[PDB]
Enzyme design. Structure first.
Site, PDB file in Angstrom:
ATOM      1  N   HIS A 151       0.131   1.825  -5.451  1.00  0.00           N
ATOM      2  CA  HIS A 151      -0.973   2.776  -5.206  1.00  0.00           C
ATOM      3  C   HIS A 151      -0.911   4.100  -5.849  1.00  0.00           C
ATOM      4  O   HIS A 151      -1.846   4.888  -5.622  1.00  0.00           O
ATOM      5  CB  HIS A 151      -1.042   2.967  -3.695  1.00  0.00           C
ATOM      6  CG  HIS A 151      -1.369   1.726  -2.961  1.00  0.00           C
ATOM      7  ND1 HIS A 151      -2.565   1.054  -3.201  1.00  0.00           N
ATOM      8  CD2 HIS A 151      -0.678   0.973  -2.092  1.00  0.00           C
ATOM      9  CE1 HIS A 151      -2.571  -0.065  -2.478  1.00  0.00           C
ATOM     10  NE2 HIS A 151      -1.430  -0.140  -1.796  1.00  0.00           N
ATOM     11  N   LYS A 156      -4.184 -10.010  -5.471  1.00  0.00           N
ATOM     12  CA  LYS A 156      -4.700  -9.266  -4.325  1.00  0.00           C
ATOM     13  C   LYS A 156      -6.219  -9.099  -4.490  1.00  0.00           C
ATOM     14  O   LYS A 156      -6.727  -8.869  -5.593  1.00  0.00           O
ATOM     15  CB  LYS A 156      -4.127  -7.837  -4.248  1.00  0.00           C
ATOM     16  CG  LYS A 156      -2.764  -7.755  -3.768  1.00  0.00           C
ATOM     17  CD  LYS A 156      -2.343  -6.234  -3.640  1.00  0.00           C
ATOM     18  CE  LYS A 156      -2.828  -5.420  -2.487  1.00  0.00           C
ATOM     19  NZ  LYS A 156      -2.049  -4.124  -2.533  1.00  0.00           N
ATOM     20  N   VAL A 198      -8.093  -6.667  -3.477  1.00  0.00           N
ATOM     21  CA  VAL A 198      -8.434  -5.259  -3.796  1.00  0.00           C
ATOM     22  C   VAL A 198      -7.112  -4.456  -3.852  1.00  0.00           C
ATOM     23  O   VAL A 198      -6.190  -4.731  -3.063  1.00  0.00           O
ATOM     24  CB  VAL A 198      -9.412  -4.654  -2.755  1.00  0.00           C
ATOM     25  CG1 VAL A 198      -8.873  -4.771  -1.320  1.00  0.00           C
ATOM     26  CG2 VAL A 198      -9.788  -3.178  -3.099  1.00  0.00           C
ATOM     27  N   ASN A 199      -7.055  -3.533  -4.787  1.00  0.00           N
ATOM     28  CA  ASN A 199      -5.925  -2.623  -4.859  1.00  0.00           C
ATOM     29  C   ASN A 199      -6.440  -1.347  -5.380  1.00  0.00           C
ATOM     30  O   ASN A 199      -6.969  -1.276  -6.486  1.00  0.00           O
ATOM     31  CB  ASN A 199      -4.858  -3.232  -5.763  1.00  0.00           C
ATOM     32  CG  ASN A 199      -3.564  -2.426  -5.695  1.00  0.00           C
ATOM     33  OD1 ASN A 199      -2.731  -2.626  -4.761  1.00  0.00           O
ATOM     34  ND2 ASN A 199      -3.414  -1.452  -6.613  1.00  0.00           N
ATOM     35  N   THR A 200      -6.161  -0.294  -4.608  1.00  0.00           N
ATOM     36  CA  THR A 200      -6.571   1.022  -5.045  1.00  0.00           C
ATOM     37  C   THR A 200      -5.439   1.818  -5.590  1.00  0.00           C
ATOM     38  O   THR A 200      -4.352   1.942  -5.011  1.00  0.00           O
ATOM     39  CB  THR A 200      -7.163   1.803  -3.844  1.00  0.00           C
ATOM     40  OG1 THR A 200      -8.384   1.144  -3.421  1.00  0.00           O
ATOM     41  CG2 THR A 200      -7.625   3.249  -4.277  1.00  0.00           C
ATOM     42  N   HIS A 250       1.840   2.518   3.182  1.00  0.00           N
ATOM     43  CA  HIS A 250       0.756   1.512   3.102  1.00  0.00           C
ATOM     44  C   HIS A 250      -0.546   2.249   2.823  1.00  0.00           C
ATOM     45  O   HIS A 250      -0.766   3.382   3.252  1.00  0.00           O
ATOM     46  CB  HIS A 250       0.720   0.743   4.428  1.00  0.00           C
ATOM     47  CG  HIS A 250      -0.482  -0.106   4.628  1.00  0.00           C
ATOM     48  ND1 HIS A 250      -0.523  -1.404   4.229  1.00  0.00           N
ATOM     49  CD2 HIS A 250      -1.667   0.176   5.220  1.00  0.00           C
ATOM     50  CE1 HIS A 250      -1.698  -1.909   4.561  1.00  0.00           C
ATOM     51  NE2 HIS A 250      -2.413  -0.974   5.149  1.00  0.00           N
TER      52      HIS A 250
END
Length: 126
Positions: free
Chosen positions: A14, A45, A47-49, A117
């Site tokens: 992230h 995955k 979504v991953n920001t 997280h």
């Protein structure tokens, strides 16, 4: 619980100070961060920001620059982010994403002052 291991994984998934939407696929793939779906050795995955800020600045969300949000913490100030949403492919090195560049109040889980997280939005894949 291994807070420092989780923090390092949070940096890998992230923290991207110079990220951009055009870099979603290359950064998430195996030649860079090799980010994979939990419970898998090679899955995509959904979504991953990436937060486009330095790790020390993001860690302050877990200190005075964050306020509680249930079992998580919300940043007091918005942060620039690149949200990568799965478009096609179900395994590495072929996970292909669509990215959106935005400014968001980020929501994180913190442990003794360290982020461990990132709370993602629910997403529609494909």
């Amino acid at each position: 619980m291994h807070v420092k291991e989780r923090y390092k994984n949070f940096l890998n998934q992230h923290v991207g100070p110079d990220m951009s939407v055009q870099r979603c696929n290359s950064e998430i793939g195996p030649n860079n961060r090799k980010i994979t779906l939990s419970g898998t050795d090679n899955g995509c995955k959904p979504v991953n920001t990436f937060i486009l800020a330095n790790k020390r600045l993001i860690k302050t969300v877990c200190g005075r620059a964050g306020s509680p949000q249930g079992n998580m913490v919300r940043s007091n100030q918005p942060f620039p982010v690149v949200k990568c949403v799965l478009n096609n492919g179900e395994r590495h090195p072929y996970c292909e994403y669509r990215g959106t560049r935005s400014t968001r109040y980020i929501v994180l889980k913190c442990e003794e002052g360290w982020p461990v997280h990132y709370h993602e939005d629910e997403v529609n894949v494909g």
